[PDB]
Design an enzyme around this catalytic site. Sequence first.
Site, short mmCIF file in Angstrom:
data_model
loop_
_atom_site.label_atom_id
_atom_site.label_comp_id
_atom_site.label_asym_id
_atom_site.label_seq_id
_atom_site.Cartn_x
_atom_site.Cartn_y
_atom_site.Cartn_z
N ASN A 62 -13.05 8.17 -8.30
CA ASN A 62 -13.42 7.42 -7.11
C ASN A 62 -14.78 6.73 -7.29
OD1 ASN A 62 -11.04 8.67 -5.95
ND2 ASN A 62 -12.35 10.42 -5.40
N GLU B 19 -18.41 1.67 -3.70
CA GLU B 19 -17.98 1.70 -2.31
C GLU B 19 -19.14 1.75 -1.31
OE1 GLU B 19 -14.76 4.60 -1.95
OE2 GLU B 19 -13.37 3.00 -2.63
N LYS C 231 -40.05 -3.96 12.42
CA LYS C 231 -40.35 -3.07 11.32
C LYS C 231 -39.18 -2.19 10.93
CE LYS C 231 -44.56 -3.68 12.95
NZ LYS C 231 -44.63 -3.26 14.37
N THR D 227 -8.29 -16.11 -9.48
CA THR D 227 -8.64 -16.75 -8.22
C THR D 227 -7.52 -16.35 -7.27
OG1 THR D 227 -7.52 -18.87 -8.65
CG2 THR D 227 -9.65 -18.68 -9.54
N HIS D 228 -7.88 -16.06 -6.02
CA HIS D 228 -6.92 -15.53 -5.06
C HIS D 228 -6.39 -14.15 -5.49
CE1 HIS D 228 -6.31 -19.88 -3.63
NE2 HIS D 228 -6.79 -20.02 -4.85
N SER E 122 -11.19 14.76 -9.29
CA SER E 122 -10.64 16.11 -9.31
C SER E 122 -10.34 16.49 -10.75
CB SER E 122 -9.38 16.18 -8.44
OG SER E 122 -8.58 17.32 -8.75
N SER F 182 -45.02 3.44 18.34
CA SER F 182 -44.49 2.91 17.08
C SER F 182 -44.85 3.78 15.88
CB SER F 182 -44.97 1.47 16.86
OG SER F 182 -46.36 1.37 17.09
N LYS G 288 -8.37 9.58 -12.74
CA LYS G 288 -8.73 8.91 -11.50
C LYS G 288 -10.19 9.23 -11.15
CE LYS G 288 -4.83 10.32 -9.35
NZ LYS G 288 -4.19 10.80 -8.08
N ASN H 97 -52.15 -7.53 17.47
CA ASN H 97 -51.26 -8.66 17.15
C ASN H 97 -51.63 -9.28 15.80
OD1 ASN H 97 -50.49 -8.12 19.76
ND2 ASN H 97 -51.39 -9.92 20.68
N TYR I 9 -47.56 -13.66 21.08
CA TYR I 9 -47.06 -12.31 20.88
C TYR I 9 -46.31 -11.74 22.11
CZ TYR I 9 -46.80 -7.32 19.92
OH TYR I 9 -46.33 -6.04 19.76
#
Lengths: 451, 455
Positions: free
Chosen positions: B283, B288, B323, B153-154, B275, B20, B281, B108, B315
């Site tokens: 991005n 994202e 972890k 909404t929607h 660009s 580990s 424009k 443990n 345990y």
Amino acid sequence: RFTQAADQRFKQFNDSLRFDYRLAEQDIVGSVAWSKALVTVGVLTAEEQAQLEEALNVLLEDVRARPQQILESDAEDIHSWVEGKLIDKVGQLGKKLHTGRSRNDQVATDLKLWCKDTVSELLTANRQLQSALVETAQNNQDAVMPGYTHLQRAQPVTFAHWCLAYVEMLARDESRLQDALKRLDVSPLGCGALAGTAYEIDREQLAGWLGFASATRNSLDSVSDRDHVLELLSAAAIGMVHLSRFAEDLIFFNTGEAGFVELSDRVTSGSSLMPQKKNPDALELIRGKCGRVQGALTGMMMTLKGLPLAYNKDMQEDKEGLFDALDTWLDCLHMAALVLDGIQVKRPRCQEAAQQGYANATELADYLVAKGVPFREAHHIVGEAVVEAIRQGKPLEDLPLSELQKFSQVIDEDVYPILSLQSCLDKRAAKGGVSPQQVAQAIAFAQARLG
Amino acid sequence: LWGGRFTQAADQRFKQFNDSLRFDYRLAEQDIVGSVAWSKALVTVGVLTAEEQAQLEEALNVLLEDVRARPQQILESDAEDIHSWVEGKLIDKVGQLGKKLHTGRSRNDQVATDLKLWCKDTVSELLTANRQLQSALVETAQNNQDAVMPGYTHLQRAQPVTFAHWCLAYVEMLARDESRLQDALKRLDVSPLGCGALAGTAYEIDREQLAGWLGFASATRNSLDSVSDRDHVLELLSAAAIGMVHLSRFAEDLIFFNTGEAGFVELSDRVTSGSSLMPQKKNPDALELIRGKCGRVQGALTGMMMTLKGLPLAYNKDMQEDKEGLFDALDTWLDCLHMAALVLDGIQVKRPRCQEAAQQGYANATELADYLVAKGVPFREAHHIVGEAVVEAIRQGKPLEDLPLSELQKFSQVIDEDVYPILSLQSCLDKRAAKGGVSPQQVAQAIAFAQARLG
């Protein structure tokens, strides 16, 4: 200063090199193939294509022989890393290579090439576990033990039949991998950023150069499609479910309460506190690792859910999970094989527990029913006979005839062979049944099929 | 730490699989600090003398300062895990004394404590990051009270709202994340150290004194539960999952406001790509990525639930899988909270476009129904009437306000020249005058309240 820290944080947040270096070799052979498409399309002469191929071959050999060099760079991803290393060897010709190509169809291609290489390694590791299981089975055909339903002793089984159960599970994992392979074997190269190359490239010819079986039919789909990662993650999650069951059984068989199995020192570890412990760590990690594969699957689903076409930076999240889950799956497949290699089945204890199950009470019941005793009365009688047998601490077969005849007068000497463990096994003689003759034939059939 | 029970060494592939260290070295500081506290418990009970403890603390503190300086050095070792690494380095330093520290303790026990210490620090950081975001949202609200825009909404134009109101919506989401982190912290602020491998230390140690030394609020009541408990990881993962859902909606909104179609918002170059050919424009890279990163946090959650499911007491080695999942998930959540704040500064709201759009899509149609109500027309009837007026307005390609009175009176004779002020953008806002509403006075009260809560 804290503005610069924030911009440097953004660069770490945004960059993919630290995991996408894993695509170096695929990006490079992918570039070789593109270069040839450009010749058909008049961007590159045949000479520039040969020089580009030459430099890519050298780079490939160098990445193979020293992959750690990539992560020494601060390039944002491998595509840009490879581009930079190309420009060093060839100058601006290494930029011209990107003509008519996007990172969107480029990474889509690299990723599918990687999946092919990886599915190949998974198929091998999977076949190796099957073979380890079949070999274990061959060496344990005599290991009669209790079968379990609800973790309660049911009809006896042999350790070998238990092994071949996992062989069958693994065989379906194998066909799932084969099917996913065939389905992902489609080249997305030539699809531009989303609407196709602005050149008259022959994409089916290009696919052939890439080793793919055909070219994609829709550019929007080509750049946005990560089905193959979802499907491979599914295959892995189901494979890991299989391994988690294998681990659960072996861990129970390995308890002091069962005592069915002893594991090798090679594959086991101790306790920092308790001087006696010898723990099945490898089996426990195999089942504990089921979750990270499952998490990778769930995460990829969530990432793609509700995502508009065509390309989106969310899709950079397609790699870390896939890489981790397939690495995990491969490691677990190997580790399960290793556990089997050193395993010792403790046959006397397995058989002792089989006999303490009283499954043969059934065979007694319809011996009695076959002898004419009514169903309800037969079951009452065997119930009584079983209580008495546990009171005396012996199997039904161990009661002298004078004792059994006190439960039913119709019981005779012929009862004893019909109550034996061997007899109860031999009755399950249909395909996949636990009779030694069937198990033996299943082992042979799996040897032939596995090679 | 073990081996006397074994006749043969581990296979190399098993070692790589089982170790580990490559990730648990992140717990180095916690492990050493817990070890110091343990050395004090050991004096209490006659295992160590005062001078032996003083000597162990010295060597541990040297390791602590070494490990703080360059944690990477740990990874040069082939030690199984951080606990074996610490013990091995102690022994090099103090000899046989180092072999005494682990008395009455188990890994443990130890790892359970190290992980809770780490959670405490991490929750604190999440809380800090959550509060800066809130306060960055509050400040954006402060500066964009006049930015009327469409509400949705929607994803359909609903009723007008303001960008300030939108901002404060995320403040409310984050404030519940904040309280979830605080509640989680309280439940976890309990010391498991002194519970051996499952049944307790075999020593008369005062576990509440030990808790004090470690900075916990109290000590756990049950050894079996203590060594097997990962509720706090599930609870933190689940808080992170909810928190990440909030961030994904924040991302979705802004990515939408940033479209050529909406044009509500301009983002900084710091947080976008684009660009030189089409400098308009941008991005929304950071956004994202924030929404894309929701999955891995969800995945860590699912994964830890699966690994804990059906596991017997106490345990089990499966729990080593806690972890990597938690580290990734809380790091991700922290990075996204920071990037969300980065996206907020330099954000510019494009007011003329926002306002133009707020006046489209018959988003003032509720006002006409309400206006009809005030004249005695049952709401349901008013609603139907106005709907039909909208069908006719669409057919003419006109907003409701542009319908002549003679046309509107075909729908209801009760409509008079006083509808028109009621159809205005400013009146849509002013009328929403109840708490949490969009009127200028409510939003101002909400901003001032959020500023006070956070200051």
